[PDB]
Design a protein around this ligand. Structure first.
Ligand SMILES: COc1ccc(C(=C2C=CC(N(C)C)C=C2)c2ccc(N(C)C)cc2)cc1
Lengths: 156, 157
């Protein structure tokens, strides 16, 4: 409630010290804002690595979905935060999580050309044959984007 | 600075009364957050029409860009806020502004199937032949998305 609101603002601001103080006083680690985003969503969205590690250590749901079905891994794969992608997958983030558009984090990472995240997601079991609600796979994204370096990864 | 931070949080929360108080207090209408978004960006992002009109009445930059080159019109075209799209265009928003991906607001509206915003942008001079940095037009989006209704709007031009 009130502590959950201050935790969402502290996570959005990248204040890891403020997040630690809120955790010791029983703040809801999985409080949701107006779009269903948890503090881990915001730390993953803005690239706050040290904030995400504090949240995950205190029981943050690594596979929490917002109102659009996006997980914290969906947001990191969009903005290209390689270090947080690694921390999420180490804490049990589902590489095949799916939002309301049918997108896996592999879809969003392939759309925005974050190939280093694509290979890490493949290492953790991301399915290349997964189709979104528009019948698109990662192969179709490489053709649409003309990304030869992505198609060269999928060929292996 | 201090007042601009509170204006950004007030616009993100949709408190048009709190915004008007900070406006009269001398807050910077074009204050930016860590991603370069103005209060008009946030009001356009979350669909707060009354907040966006208050900002525009007090000299908000209708064509402000964030760190990724997105204008408030780019955000409304993404989230399908039709009422704010018309308000921005009535206040002089560039209907053909591009971001770092070369996307016009017509590209983002066509990607997310916001056909009402597509036609409104066309009424304000949006170029259908505009290509992004990947050589994509709204015709390529209609074929890629398989949007029957979008391709029907484009062929009637
Ligand atoms: C704000 O977060 C996002 C998320 C996705 C996109 C985007 C798409 C792609 C496919 C879409 N549909 C509904 C088929 C809808 C939206 C997209 C389209 C093209 C590219 N390229 C070619 C780099 C990247 C992303 C845009 C922004």
């Amino acid at each position: 409630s009130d502590l959950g609101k201050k935790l969402l603002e502290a996570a959005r601001a990248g204040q890891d010290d403020e997040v630690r103080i809120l955790m010791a006083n029983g703040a809801d680690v999985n409080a949701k804002d107006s779009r269903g985003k948890t503090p881990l969503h915001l730390a993953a969205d803005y690239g706050y690595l040290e904030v995400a590690e504090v949240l995950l250590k205190h029981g943050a749901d690594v596979n929490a979905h917002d109102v659009y079905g996006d997980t914290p891994l969906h947001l990191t794969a969009t903005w290209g935060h390689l270090e947080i992608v690694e921390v999420l997958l180490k804490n049990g983030a589902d590489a095949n999580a799916i939002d309301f558009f049918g997108w896996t984090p592999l879809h969003l990472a392939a759309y925005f050309g974050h190939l280093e995240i694509v290979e890490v997601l493949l290492k953790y079991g991301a399915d290349v044959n997964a189709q979104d609600k528009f019948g698109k796979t990662v192969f179709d994204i490489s053709v649409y984007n003309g990304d030869e370096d992505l198609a060269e990864i999928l060929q292996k």
